[PDB]
Amino acid sequence: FRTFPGIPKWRKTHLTYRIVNYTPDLPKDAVDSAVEKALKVWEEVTPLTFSRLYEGEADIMISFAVREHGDFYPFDGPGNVLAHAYAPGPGINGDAHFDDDEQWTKDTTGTNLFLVAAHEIGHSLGLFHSANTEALMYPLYHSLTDLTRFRLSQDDINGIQSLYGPPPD
Ligand SMILES: [Ca+2]
Ligand SMILES: [Ca+2]
Ligand SMILES: [Ca+2]
Ligand SMILES: [Zn+2]
Ligand SMILES: [Zn+2]
């Protein structure tokens, strides 16, 4: 595992999230599930908790965008960059943007939302790119057909617990 410079991390244990908009690619409740599922992955191995907001600014703002959206890093059309997120902090920090020029799916027939979400939210919680090929933080998005087999790798667990520790009890 690897962490950002000056090891940015949330100084609080309870974080809020907000799904700013929805993609035409999927039913709305499939986006919610993917996100809440992605949150569970991290929540389970740390004392971190999450709650949802539908107004105001949440710690982690989630949205779907195309090309040039609200920042200095415009998306790039089909394929390649799938999504991007900011390390812990105020404002756009912790925020996660997803490229809609991809076909987001609940399965592996295009770009699986849950898988990329899990990855991006890694970045939101302070994790950088791992060198371990079997890790979720590894920069390689494979069309991991076997979602049925997915398991957070010990490397990812090590890295997130380095910042927030194991669950309370
Ligand atoms: Ca934020
Ligand atoms: Ca792209
Ligand atoms: Ca699309
Ligand atoms: Zn962006
Ligand atoms: Zn990444």
Q: Does the domain made of 1-169 have the CATH classification 3.40.630.30?
A: no
Q: Give the number of the ligand closest to the Cα of residue 65.
A: 4
CA–CA distance, 84 with 15 (Å, rounded to integer) = 19
Q: Give the number of the ligand closest to the Cα of residue 24.
A: 3
Which two tokens mark 101? 């020029």
* CA 70 to ligand 4 centroid distance, Å: 6
Residues with CB under 5 A from ligand 1 (ion): 94-95
Residue 71 annotated in ligand binding? yes
CA–CA distance, 59 with 79 (Å, rounded to integer) = 28
- Annotated active-site residue in 36, 44, 68, 120: 120
For residue 114, which phi and psi values (nearest 5 degrees)?
A: -55, -45
Q: Is residue 162 classed as helix, strand or coil in its secondary structure?
A: helix
43 catalytic, yes or no? Answer: no
* CA 25 to ligand 3 centroid distance, Å: 6
* CA 149 to ligand 1 centroid distance, Å: 32
CA–CA distance, 135 with 26 (Å, rounded to integer) = 27
For residue 40, which phi and psi values (nearest 5 degrees)?
A: -55, -45
For strands 96-99 and 83-85, give the pairing. antiparallel
* Cβ–Cβ under 8 Å, residues 128 and 163: no
* CA 98 to ligand 2 centroid distance, Å: 9
* Cβ–Cβ under 8 Å, residues 114 and 147: yes
Q: What is the resolution of this structure in A?
A: 2.4
